[PDB]
Design a protein around this ligand. Structure first.
Ligand SMILES: *[C@@H]1O[C@H](CO)[C@@H](O[C@@H]2O[C@H](CO)[C@@H](O)[C@H](O)[C@H]2NC(C)=O)[C@H](O)[C@H]1NC(C)=O
Ligand SMILES: *[C@@H]1O[C@H](CO)[C@@H](O[C@@H]2O[C@H](CO)[C@@H](O)[C@H](O)[C@H]2NC(C)=O)[C@H](O)[C@H]1NC(C)=O
Ligand SMILES: *[C@@H]1O[C@H](CO)[C@@H](O[C@@H]2O[C@H](CO)[C@@H](O)[C@H](O)[C@H]2NC(C)=O)[C@H](O)[C@H]1NC(C)=O
Ligand SMILES: *[C@@H]1O[C@H](CO)[C@@H](O)[C@H](O)[C@H]1NC(C)=O
Ligand SMILES: *[C@@H]1O[C@H](CO)[C@@H](O)[C@H](O)[C@H]1NC(C)=O
Ligand SMILES: *[C@@H]1O[C@H](CO)[C@@H](O)[C@H](O)[C@H]1NC(C)=O
Ligand SMILES: *[C@@H]1O[C@H](CO)[C@@H](O)[C@H](O)[C@H]1NC(C)=O
Ligand SMILES: *[C@@H]1O[C@H](CO)[C@@H](O)[C@H](O)[C@H]1NC(C)=O
Ligand SMILES: *[C@@H]1O[C@H](CO)[C@@H](O)[C@H](O)[C@H]1NC(C)=O
Lengths: 237, 198, 258, 50
């Protein structure tokens, strides 16, 4: 009820639809396992890390068989065939080439580590803001009005389950900005004036629940000769 | 198209991006922030302006009793933008730097092809027409090596720039989500002052 | 033919990049412009091998009224069939239609390709941005929802990667003393490499530490799981299995394979 | 040059990754909506001029 109140819906909406909301939540949480299992490419982000690490290591170890313009790619062969004062010319090329291989590997690793750190920082922020509280930022903790989130672990990563509120089944209505009565203007406190064709009510914005217009949910604060589009009716006491 | 260097076209053309922008503008004008969280719900523009004033701590009757003045101020402010952008020459340096850096890097890479790297000549055809097979290798090796480091340097610089571009794009996406599809309470995130709409 | 105004003593021509772009014919005094012959990349567009064996070929950035025959370098073979001209090059083996769907395989400036039933074939089209919609705007009309829906979505984020270490002597010189002594003259690169790798590993540990260790206590759920009708059995730990993991966590750990 | 290993594969892979990232940046910045809304034919919005 507090979490509904935090997005602009009163508590009696929850307290009078408890079973329906529970059933909807249960079905939605049930569908997640099927949705994850059916799609094969749902976890590409976590697989790319393993693939890149394996590919880099494989390339580094495969580079050891290159010649770099030498007689052979094996040190033992040169040490068993040739003599001390001449093997240096062959050994230098191997040493150099292996040095650039190592340097390239290290530079690529640093560049990847920077991106991984950025992603980890984003994950930490989401853990702090979506799980330990309720977020007003739009499209930060899912699509819709955020309610609450749950964390789950995964190989080299985290998975967030976001629960959101989505409106549905809208309807045409006629509206006015203010109500004229006894030469005084009336504005709603929280909500909007609405008409079903012949009568006027005041309602909240995110859920249809008409009420009788009364001095307890309006304030006067003005006159009737300035507002554009004012409509005059009766205000009950 | 200069010695094995090609430029690929972007996937989304300019017309498609313009259509996206037009759709976003129409949605935020005829609905408000409702189309960013579900179905789009219509509402008259002055009423959502009253909602947006209410969202920063000012009552609605302040808007409803100063409608013409606020409209005139908004119209003048939106009018001044074209002059402000056109007059200042260095207003769009951020977007020009991308083009300048790309052109400079490509020019340096193609200019590096005329170096000798301690060889007899910088042209392969000259060596292939003057010398013989068993000796041209000593000259060819230096050229191959130098061109290899040139390519490696170019690629590393490109990666380093791409990281920064990605960070800027992420910031732009966040601003699109938070300042355009809603109203922001974060200070100095969607301009200077109390945010209304973008 | 060249329209350049050569001075009566110069013969060659150069550009900003210092390349030859003009020449003078010796026997007959005339100026000729030189342009390089066409070249480019070749791309192959295919659906999965589990679906079909047909393919399409894209020649990138080439007007292909000029290339019915060319060599592949990395051999002459041509395809014919259906030829279409796009902005990214031109396409062989695919048919252009007038419809518009969601993009499946991106190609170029707003062009996508797909495997359709027309029998089945490969088709090319212009991507569709979405479904057209117009909202009924008026200055005294409003819309208010009368029902709601609870939705659950997922988001996946990487946190850390593998920690590796490298030894210079073993990798470079194996177990040769002469190679090590020769390498000793190259300075102190190995110290830098070791320092970089160690820093990366420490950072990798700190990432997980700062993501997951957000609490100081270790709270425990009540023995009886009644929460007003809500059912959290799919995300709470399962004590029956030895790993002590939720069903969703088990599925996630099974899905990712080394 | 064939004796120098497999540097070219690495260069090609890096450049291809950069290009794909470049496309994804625009895709995630601009494609924020699913529908294509259209403005009403008559442009009166209470005195505001867009
Ligand atoms: C709001 O939507 C819910 C969800 O569809 C509606 O509840 C359904 O009502 C029908 C009609 O009796 C049942 O057959 C379904 O089983 C209900 N769904 C669930 C999950 O219980 C509800 O009726 C709607 N509200 C109104 C006022 O019509
Ligand atoms: C919470 O949901 C789970 C999953 O649907 C329920 O477990 C099911 O219980 C029924 C009845 O015992 C079994 O027939 C199913 O096989 C169970 N499913 C699984 C996946 O084990 C559980 O009963 C629900 N909680 C409550 C209190 O009813
Ligand atoms: C909205 O502003 C534009 C720009 O000031 C107005 O267009 C001007 O209209 C007047 C009268 O027709 C012309 O004399 C100007 O030359 C127009 N300016 C431009 C730049 O075209 C437009 O009239 C305004 N909207 C309304 C409803 O008045
Ligand atoms: C609201 O009014 C418009 C215009 O008459 C109409 O197209 C739309 O269907 C109405 N909304 C509903 C939920 O019927
Ligand atoms: C509008 O609501 C009033 C409430 O008293 C009711 O009497 C009237 O019949 C309603 N009109 C329509 C068209 O539903
Ligand atoms: C009530 O509104 C009507 C419609 O605008 C108007 O003609 C009438 O004068 C108003 N009542 C009074 C007492 O002014
Ligand atoms: C391709 O060449 C033809 C030959 O005249 C020309 O008409 C056409 O415009 C060219 N198209 C492109 C894209 O260059
Ligand atoms: C495809 O058909 C549509 C509808 O007739 C037409 O607008 C479009 O120009 C056609 N595309 C062609 C001929 O390339
Ligand atoms: C605004 O309201 C007036 C009635 O006061 C109406 O004539 C006009 O059509 C409305 N504007 C639009 C765009 O419908």
């Amino acid at each position: 009820a507090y979490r509904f109140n935090g997005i602009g819906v009163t508590q009696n909406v929850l307290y009078e639809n408890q079973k329906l909301i529970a059933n909807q939540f249960n079905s939605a949480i049930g569908k997640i396992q099927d949705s994850l299992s059916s799609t094969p490419s749902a976890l590409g982000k976590l697989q790319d890390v393993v693939n890149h690490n394996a590919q880099a290591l494989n390339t580094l170890v495969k580079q050891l068989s290159s010649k770099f313009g030498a007689i052979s790619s094996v040190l033992n062969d040169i040490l068993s065939r040739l003599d001390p004062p001449e093997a240096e010319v062959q050994i230098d090329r191997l040493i150099t080439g292996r040095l650039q291989s190592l340097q390239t590997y290290v530079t690529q690793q640093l560049i990847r580590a920077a991106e991984i750190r950025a992603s980890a920082n984003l994950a930490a922020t989401k853990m702090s803001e979506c799980v330990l509280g309720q977020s007003k930022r739009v499209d930060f903790c899912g699509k819709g009005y955020h309610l609450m989130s749950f964390p789950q672990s995964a190989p080299h990563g985290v998975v967030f389950l976001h629960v959101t509120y989505v409106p549905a089944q809208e309807k045409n209505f006629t509206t006015a900005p203010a109500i004229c009565h006894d030469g005084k203007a009336h504005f709603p406190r929280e909500g909007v004036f609405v008409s079903n064709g012949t009568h006027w009510f005041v309602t909240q914005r995110n859920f249809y629940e008409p009420q009788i217009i009364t001095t307890d949910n309006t304030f006067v604060s003005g006159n009737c000769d300035v507002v554009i589009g004012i409509v005059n009716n009766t205000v009950y006491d | 198209k200069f010695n094995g260097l090609t430029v690929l076209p972007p996937l989304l053309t300019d017309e498609m991006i313009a259509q996206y922008t037009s759709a976003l503008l129409a949605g935020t004008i005829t609905s408000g922030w409702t189309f960013g969280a579900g179905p789009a719900l219509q509402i008259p523009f002055p009423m959502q302006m009253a909602y947006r004033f209410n969202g920063i701590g000012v009552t609605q009757n302040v808007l409803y009793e100063n409608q013409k003045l606020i409209a005139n101020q908004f119209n003048s402010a939106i009018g001044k933008i074209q002059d402000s952008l056109s007059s200042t020459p260095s207003a769009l340096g951020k977007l020009q730097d991308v083009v300048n850096h790309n052109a400079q890097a490509l020019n340096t890479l193609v200019k590096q092809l005329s170096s000798k790297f301690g060889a007899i000549s910088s042209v392969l055809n000259d060596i292939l027409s003057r010398l013989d097979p068993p000796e041209a290798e000593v000259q060819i090796d230096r050229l191959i090596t130098g061109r290899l480091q040139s390519l490696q340097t170019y690629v590393t610089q490109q990666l380093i720039r791409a990281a920064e571009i990605r960070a800027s794009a992420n910031l732009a996406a966040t601003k699109m989500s938070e300042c355009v599809l809603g109203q922001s309470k974060r200070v100095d995130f969607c301009g200077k002052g109390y945010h209304l709409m973008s | 033919e060249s329209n350049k105004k050569f001075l009566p003593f110069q013969q060659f021509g150069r550009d900003i990049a210092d390349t030859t772009d003009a020449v003078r014919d010796p026997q007959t005094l005339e100026i000729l412009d030189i342009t390089p012959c066409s070249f480019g990349g070749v791309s192959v567009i295919t659906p999965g091998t589990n679906t079909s064996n047909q393919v399409a070929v894209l020649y990138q950035g080439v007007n292909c009224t000029e290339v019915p025959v060319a060599i592949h370098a990395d051999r002459v073979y041509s395809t014919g069939s259906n030829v279409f001209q796009t902005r990214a090059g031109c396409l062989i083996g695919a048919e252009y239609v007038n419809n518009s769907y969601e993009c499946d395989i991106p190609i170029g400036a707003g062009i996508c390709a797909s495997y359709q039933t027309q029998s089945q074939s490969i088709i090319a089209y212009t991507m569709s941005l979405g479904a057209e919609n117009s909202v009924a705007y008026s200055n005294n009309s409003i819309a208010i929802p009368t029902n709601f829906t609870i939705s659950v979505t997922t988001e996946i984020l990487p946190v850390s990667m593998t920690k590796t270490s490298v030894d210079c002597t073993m990798y470079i010189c194996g177990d040769s003393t002469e190679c090590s002594n020769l390498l000793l003259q190259y300075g102190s690169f190995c110290t830098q490499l070791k320092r970089a790798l160690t820093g990366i590993a420490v950072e990798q540990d700190k990432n997980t530490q700062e993501v997951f260790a957000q609490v100081k206590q270790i709270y425990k759920t009540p023995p009886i799981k009644y929460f007003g009708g809500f059912n959290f059995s799919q995300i709470l730990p399962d004590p029956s299995k030895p790993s002590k993991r939720s069903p969703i966590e088990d599925l996630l750990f099974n899905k990712v394979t080394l």
